[PDB]
């Protein structure tokens, strides 16, 4: 409540969640290459996990 959460971590978990829910890379809302790397990083980790879920 007093201070904003880590932007990189949040960006990595937003990436994961679009991942699992099956959106396309290139929905990524970041052009800040730093946050972008976190977003895709999550999105690709999530692509692995979808396989073993139903």
């Amino acid at each position: 409540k007093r201070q904003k959460r880590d932007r990189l971590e949040r960006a990595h978990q937003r990436g994961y969640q679009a991942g699992i829910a099956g959106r396309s890379k290139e929905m990524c809302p970041y052009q800040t290459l730093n946050q972008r790397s976190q977003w895709l990083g999550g999105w690709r980790e999530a692509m692995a996990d979808r396989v073993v879920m139903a």
Binding site: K1, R2, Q3, R5, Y16
Partner: protein, 155 residues
């Protein structure tokens, strides 16, 4: 909350045994702002724990605490029409908070005369895997063990 809460508080350690741990334990038992009343009730219990185990106080009250801390809890998560109970690690500080809460909760729910008696008995029983307090932990652990399959979701 959505942002991060900044500024953790400062528990002063116990006047007697000079422990932040026991100081927390008082607050948890404390009711309606009556810190002194709680301070009494606590020491008189440890007396009567010490006077039977004969194993110090800040070292006896501990042994109760170890018999009852959980290591894995369950979080609920709505999936389809159903609700998935899912097992998660417990944070060290959390499993302190839970042990101390379950001990207090178990104490009050007894028929003994003083509060001090109830606490004492409960802490003793805790040390020999016995009371409701320790029953509760067992049950928690049973549930997380049951639905282990949902260990690795992130959902």
């Amino acid at each position: 909350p959505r942002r991060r809460v900044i500024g953790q508080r400062k528990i002063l350690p116990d006047p007697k045994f000079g422990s932040e741990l026991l100081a927390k334990f008082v607050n948890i038992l404390m009711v309606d702002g009556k810190k002194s009343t709680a301070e009494s009730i606590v020491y008189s219990a440890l007396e009567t724990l010490a006077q039977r185990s004969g194993k110090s106080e800040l070292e006896a009250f501990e042994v109760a605490l170890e018999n009852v801390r959980p290591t894995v809890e369950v979080k609920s998560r709505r999936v389809g029409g159903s609700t998935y109970q899912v097992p998660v690690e417990v944070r060290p500080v959390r499993r302190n908070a839970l042990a101390m809460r379950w001990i207090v909760e178990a104490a009050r729910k007894r028929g003994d005369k003083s509060m001090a008696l109830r606490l004492a008995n409960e802490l003793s029983d805790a040390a020999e895997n016995k009371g409701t307090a320790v029953k509760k932990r067992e049950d928690v652990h049973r549930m997380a063990e049951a639905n282990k399959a949902f260990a690795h979701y992130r959902w």
